[PDB]
């Protein structure tokens, strides 16, 4: 459902781009920041914000990031299963890893998976390296994840009839 | 028309109901290729009928390979009847 | 069960395959709704709208057609809740605070013309007060005394008003609604199949739902 | 099956017109092309002038042939000066 934003959030940012618009006078600039926000207990989100300044852009990005939140399954403090997220010529696979590895990921993917609270991810980007589409690709891959309990309830089944 | 095809059916019937049965079908193809080839000797500048003739030759050759792989003696007796060699 | 109604229901050739579970087909070319799939759904709508007006979110009644005007207006002024009788201003719900500002401005200026000082200039009352009161009253309706976010939303036509339904579905407000055969039942949370331009059917349905919420406040 | 419709020029006497029709029927009997029906519309006003003339005689001959004396009719009607028109239509 829509996640009510009343939690404790850490709100660190990925990029601020400087972003121009040409008028009769000349170039008029803005700063388009995208910021990933979420607690490390299974709730992640990100948001874009545009302003003439950097900090008000980060304000609008943190507000829009608190608006759009996602949930992530933490089966054994990892992800449950390997998945490829495919938002628009950004494709990122996510493997579960063993318990000691740490989040092996590049910058915005690393920011999503560290601010997710998921600790042990093998991952790889198989596409373009814009931050926006890589974060969108990760959340495409994290929206389609599945809990073993819910899929066992989906199959008219039990967890141990799937998990073993 | 319509005595020639019917005579070729009634000549190459192996059962009464045979209008399929690739000997009937190959025989209609042979005499239509022969009429077409005499047509091409009349009309050398016709190319779409040549494409149709090539389609007929491909159909008839593939039906011949099907008879060769299905029944050897029937294939040899058909060849010896039609002279298609 | 035809309780009171008249609605076979609407459209010709421009129609939606997402209502295949609900409709029939007449030789007229105008579609007839299966009323067996209407009675049970309006019964569950009746129950759920009783539950929502039992809990305490007020109700929005929104109708933005010439048919819908007097029906939605008189019915919500019968039930006391918050209506929209004219255009739906873009962003009343998702853009809530700047609409609260403009409705507080309307409240100030309609208090000023009967309690406050009425003698400022010869025509600042005309050019400000009257001209400004007209538009704001006509469009801000009975959502004037709203004070709070609503719980649900009762519309009259989703195809006519895709903007309000869209940002309603965004803000996760559950919505009750009458749809048409060209409309999308996937978008409405609570689907009622009936006629959206026969005035007696829309007056009947707003009557039933206002009676449903009227049996609820006790 | 063929409809063989031709126009005799008007300035022609009646026995000479019989000699024209007997001639071209003698031409049709070079095949075996049986004459299953005859028709003379007579002197009709042509829609446009042919040589100098407004009018001409029409002849309809229904034939069931082997497509040879039709072609002999074609060559004999391109030559004979006592003919204004001819068409042969495959009656289907």
């Amino acid at each position: 459902r829509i996640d009510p934003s009343k939690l404790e959030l850490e709100e660190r940012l990925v990029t601020v781009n400087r972003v121009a618009k040409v008028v009769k006078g000349g170039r008029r600039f803005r700063f388009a920041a995208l910021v990933v926000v979420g607690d490390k207990n299974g709730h992640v989100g990100f948001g874009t914000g545009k302003a003439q300044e950097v900090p008000e852009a980060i304000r609008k990005a943190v507000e829009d990031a608190k608006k759009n939140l996602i949930e992530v399954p933490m089966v054994g403090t990892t992800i449950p299963h390997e998945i490829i997220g495919r938002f628009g010529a950004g494709n990122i696979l996510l493997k579960p890893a063993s318990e000691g590895t740490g989040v092996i990921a590049g910058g915005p993917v690393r920011a999503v998976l560290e601010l997710a609270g998921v600790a042990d991810i093998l991952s790889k980007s198989l596409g373009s390296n814009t931050p926006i589409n890589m974060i969108r690709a990760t959340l495409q891959g994290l929206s389609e994840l599945k809990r073993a309990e819910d899929v066992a309830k989906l199959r008219g089944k039990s967890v141990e009839e799937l998990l073993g | 028309t319509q005595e020639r095809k019917n005579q070729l059916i009634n000549e190459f019937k192996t059962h009464e109901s045979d209008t399929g049965s690739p000997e009937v079908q190959i025989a209609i193809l042979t005499d239509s290729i022969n009429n077409l080839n005499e047509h091409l000797r009349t009309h050398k500048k016709d190319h779409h009928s040549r494409r149709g003739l090539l389609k007929m030759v491909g159909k008839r050759r593939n039906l011949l390979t099907y008879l060769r792989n299905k029944d050897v003696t029937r294939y040899r007796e058909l060849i010896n009847k039609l002279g298609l060699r | 069960l035809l309780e009171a109604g008249v609605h076979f229901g609407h459209q010709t050739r421009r129609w939606n395959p997402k209502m295949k579970r609900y409709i029939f087909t007449e030789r007229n070319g105008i579609y007839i709704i299966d009323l067996q799939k209407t009675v049970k759904k309006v019964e569950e709508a009746y129950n759920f709208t009783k539950n929502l007006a039992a809990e305490g979110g007020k109700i929005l009644f929104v109708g933005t057609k010439k048919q819908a005007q007097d029906s939605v207006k008189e019915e919500a002024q019968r039930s006391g809740m918050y209506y929209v009788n004219q255009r739906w201003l873009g962003g009343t719900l998702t853009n809530f605070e700047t609409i609260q500002k403009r409705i507080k401005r309307l409240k100030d200026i309609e208090k000023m013309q009967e309690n406050g000082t009425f003698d400022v200039l010869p025509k600042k009352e005309v050019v400000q007060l009257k001209k400004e009161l007209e538009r704001l009253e006509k469009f801000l309706g009975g959502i004037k005394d709203m004070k709070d976010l609503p719980d649900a939303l009762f519309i009259i036509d989703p195809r006519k008003e895709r903007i309000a339904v869209a940002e309603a579905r965004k803000l996760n407000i559950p919505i009750i609604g009458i749809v048409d055969t060209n409309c999308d039942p996937d978008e409405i949370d609570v689907v009622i199949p009936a006629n959206d331009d026969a005035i007696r059917a829309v007056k009947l349905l707003t009557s039933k739902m206002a009676d449903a919420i009227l049996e609820a406040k006790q | 099956k063929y409809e063989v419709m031709y126009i005799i020029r008007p300035n022609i006497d009646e026995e000479s017109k019989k000699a024209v029709i007997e001639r071209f029927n003698n031409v049709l009997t070079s095949n075996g092309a049986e004459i299953t029906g005859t028709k003379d519309w007579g002197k009709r006003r042509l829609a446009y002038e042919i040589n100098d003339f407004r009018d001409g005689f029409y002849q309809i001959v229904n034939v069931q042939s082997d497509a040879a004396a039709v072609q002999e009719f074609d060559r004999l009607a391109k030559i004979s000066d006592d003919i204004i028109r001819h068409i042969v239509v495959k009656e289907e």
Binding site: - | - | - | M5, L46, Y48, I50, G56, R85
Partner: protein
């Protein structure tokens, strides 16, 4: 519009019907199009074939 030949049930238009073809031919001598005479596609094709053959036997005019 409405087709003529579907109404009277008549098939191959039979070039000899000079008065009917004279109805379909326009005032100057041209063939009227399908949105004027109201026929089918098939019947307009056979009509124009009919008019051209009847022109070559002077049953129909070219220019008037």
């Amino acid at each position: 519009k409405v087709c003529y030949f579907t109404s009277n049930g008549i098939t191959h238009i039979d070039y000899k019907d000079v008065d009917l073809l004279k109805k379909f031919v326009s005032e100057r001598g041209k063939i009227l199009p399908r949105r004027v005479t109201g026929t089918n596609a098939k019947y307009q094709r056979k009509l124009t074939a009919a008019i051209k053959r009847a022109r070559q036997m002077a049953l129909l005019p070219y220019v008037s």
